[PDB]
C-alpha cells in the first residue's frame, strides 16, 4: 500500500474499527446503547471536569460550592444539572445494554460479558460517590447507611468500615476521599471500556435472529455512523428534555438541605438506579444475609452464561423465555417501586415475594423453560 492514510499510520489503522469493521445488517435499535453508553461516559467526564473546576471538597463549603456553581458561575447551572441528569441517562442506558444481552445471548461472549459486569459495577461505585460530593442530607445519610452495611462482615467489617470512612463517622475525611475516587474511577473505567471493546472486536455483534451474520455483513461507516449519530440525537433529546424542562423530576431527592448529622429523612433511599438492590436488601431480616443478597443481585449476572440451557442463543425464537424475561423486567420495575416505599407491612410482604421472584426467574424458572422449549422443538 501507498498513501492509504488508514494503514499508513499504525495508529490510524486502529481507528478503522469504526469505519471498515464487519457489522451485522439486521440489528435492533437496542444496540445503539453501546455507543450511547460511551457518549454518556464522555459527557459525564467533560461535565465533571468543569464542575470540578469550581467545586470544593470540604464539609463547610461543598454545599455552598455546588450552590455557587448553580448561581454565580456562568452556565454552571446547566453544566451541573446536565451532570446530574446525565448519570440518570448513563444508567437508563446501561440497563438497556444489559437487557439486550440478557435477551439475545450476547452474553455468550463470556470474556466480553465479564468485562461488561466489571464496567457496570465500576460505574455503580462512581455514581455512589458523586452523589455524596454535594454533601446534602440525602447524600450524607445514604453514604452512612450503605457503608455501615459493610460492617455486617463478622471479623473485619467493623474495622474496615472505619478505614473506608477515615474516621468514626463521615466527616471531612470521607468527603475528600469520595471526591478523589469519583474523579479517577471514570478515567480507569475508560480503559476498561476500551478493553471491553477490544475483546468484542474479535467476534463481532450478535443479532435478533441469534444466528451468524457473516453471510450478510455491512460496513460500519456508511450505515452505522448515521444510526449512531441519530441515536445520539435522541439521547441528547432525552438528556435536555430532562435537564431543561424538569431538572429535578428524575432526581427524586429533594434534599437540597445541608447535612445535619443528628437530623434524618425517615425516608432514606438511594436514587432510582439502586432501588432494585435496596429492596432486595430489605427483604432479609438479618443484616449480613441482606448484604450477601445485595451483592448477589448484581454479581448474579456473571452466572448467566453457565445458566444458559437452550440451543438457540436467541430468545427471539423462544416464547416461554420471552415471557419470563419480560416478567423479570417488570419484577425489576416492581422492586424499584418498593425502594421509595415506607418499610411497612404492605411493601414488606410485596418486596419479599418480588425478591424471591427475581432469583427464581434468574436461577430456576428460565433455565427450566430453556430445556422445555428445546424438548418441544425435539432438539
Amino acid at each position: 500500500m501507498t498513501n492509504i492514510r488508514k494503514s499508513h499510520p499504525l495508529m490510524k489503522i486502529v481507528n478503522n474499527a469504526f469505519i471498515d469493521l464487519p457489522a451485522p445488517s439486521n440489528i435492533s435499535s437496542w444496540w445503539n446503547f453501546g455507543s450511547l453508553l460511551g457518549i454518556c461516559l464522555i459527557l459525564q467526564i467533560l461535565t465533571g471536569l468543569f464542575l470540578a473546576m469550581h467545586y470544593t471538597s470540604d464539609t463547610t463549603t461543598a454545599f455552598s460550592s455546588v450552590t455557587h456553581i448553580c448561581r454565580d458561575v456562568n452556565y454552571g447551572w446547566i453544566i451541573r444539572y446536565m451532570h446530574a441528569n446525565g448519570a440518570s441517562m448513563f444508567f437508563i442506558c446501561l440497563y438497556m445494554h444489559v437487557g439486550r444481552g440478557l435477551y439475545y445471548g450476547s452474553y455468550t461472549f463470556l470474556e466480553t460479558w465479564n468485562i461488561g459486569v466489571i464496567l457496570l459495577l465500576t460505574v455503580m461505585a462512581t455514581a455512589f460517590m458523586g452523589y455524596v460530593l454535594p454533601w446534602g442530607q440525602m447524600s450524607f445519610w445514604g453514604a452512612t447507611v450503605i457503608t455501615n452495611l459493610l460492617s455486617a462482615i463478622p471479623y473485619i467489617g467493623t474495622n474496615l468500615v472505619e478505614w473506608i470512612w477515615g474516621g468514626f463517622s463521615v466527616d471531612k475525611a470521607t468527603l475528600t476521599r469520595f471526591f478523589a475516587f469519583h474523579f479517577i474511577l471514570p478515567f480507569i473505567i475508560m480503559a476498561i471500556a476500551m478493553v471491553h471493546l477490544l475483546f468484542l472486536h474479535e467476534t463481532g455483534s450478535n443479532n435478533p435472529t441469534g444466528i451468524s451474520s457473516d453471510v450478510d455483513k455491512i460496513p460500519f461507516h456508511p450505515y452505522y455512523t448515521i444510526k449512531d449519530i441519530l441515536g445520539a440525537l435522541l439521547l441528547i433529546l432525552a438528556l435536555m428534555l430532562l435537564v431543561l424542562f424538569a431538572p429535578d423530576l428524575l432526581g427524586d431527592p429533594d434534599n437540597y438541605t445541608p447535612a445535619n448529622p443528628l437530623n434524618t429523612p425517615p425516608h432514606i433511599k438511594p436514587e432510582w438506579y439502586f432501588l432494585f438492590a435496596y429492596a432486595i436488601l430489605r427483604s432479609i431480616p438479618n443484616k449480613l444475609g441482606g448484604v450477601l443478597a445485595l451483592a448477589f443481585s448484581i454479581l448474579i449476572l456473571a452466572l448467566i452464561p453457565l445458566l444458559h440451557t437452550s440451543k438457540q442463543r436467541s430468545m427471539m425464537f423462544r416464547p416461554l423465555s420471552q415471557c419470563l424475561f419480560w416478567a423479570l423486567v417488570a419484577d425489576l420495575l416492581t422492586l424499584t417501586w418498593i425502594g421509595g416505599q415506607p418499610v411497612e407491612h404492605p411493601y414488606i410482604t410485596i418486596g419479599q415475594l418480588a425478591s424471591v421472584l427475581y432469583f427464581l426467574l434468574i436461577l430456576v424458572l428460565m433455565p427450566t423453560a430453556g430445556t422445555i422449549e428445546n424438548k418441544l422443538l425435539k432438539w
Binding site: I78, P222, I229, L233, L234, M240, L241, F245, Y256
Partner: protein, 48 residues
Amino acid sequence: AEPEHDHRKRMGLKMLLMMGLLLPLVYAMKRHKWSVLKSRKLAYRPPK
C-alpha cells in the same frame, strides 16, 4: 431556588423547537444512509 431555571425554560422552548427540526432531520439522514440496506434484493440461484 431556581433563578437559572426561569431563564432555562426559554432555552427549553428553543431546545424543543430545535429538537423537532433536528430529530426529523436526523431520521431523514438515517433513512438515506440506511436506505441502501433496505433496498437490496437477495436471491439464491444454484444450477441444480
